[PDB]
């Protein structure tokens, strides 16, 4: 929960879209 809230605020990608 604390991590999930942190990721929402910081925009941490779970399944990050390929970029490079």
Partner 1 sequence: MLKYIIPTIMLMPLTWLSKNNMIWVNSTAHSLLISFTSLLLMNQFGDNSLNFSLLFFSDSLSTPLLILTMWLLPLMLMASQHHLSKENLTRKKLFITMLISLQLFLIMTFTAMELILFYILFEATLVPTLIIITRWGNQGLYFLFYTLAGSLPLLVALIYIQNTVGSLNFLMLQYWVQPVHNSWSNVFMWLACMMAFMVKMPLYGLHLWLPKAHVEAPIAGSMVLAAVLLKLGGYGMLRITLILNPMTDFMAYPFIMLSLWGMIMTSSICLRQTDLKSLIAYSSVSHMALVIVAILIQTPWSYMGATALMIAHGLTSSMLFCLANSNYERIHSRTMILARGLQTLLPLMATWWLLASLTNLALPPTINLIGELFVVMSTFSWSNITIILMGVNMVITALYSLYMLIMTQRGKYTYHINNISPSFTRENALMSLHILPLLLLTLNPKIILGPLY
Give residues in contact with ligand 3PE (CB under 6 A).
Answer: 3, 10-12
Shortest Cβ distance from residue 6 to partner 1 (Å)? 5
Cα distance between residue 20 and residue 14, in whole Å: 17
DSSP 14: S
Nearer to ligand 3PE, 1 or 3 (CB): 3
* Cα 3 from Cα 6, distance rounded (Å): 5
Q: Per the structure block, which two tokens stand in for 3?
A: 């991590």
Interface with partner 1 includes 17 (CB under 8 A)?
A: no
Return residues touching partner 1 (CB under 8 A): 6, 9-10, 12
């Amino acid at each position: 929960a604390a991590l999930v809230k942190m990721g929402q605020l910081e925009g941490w990608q779970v399944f990050a879209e390929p970029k490079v």
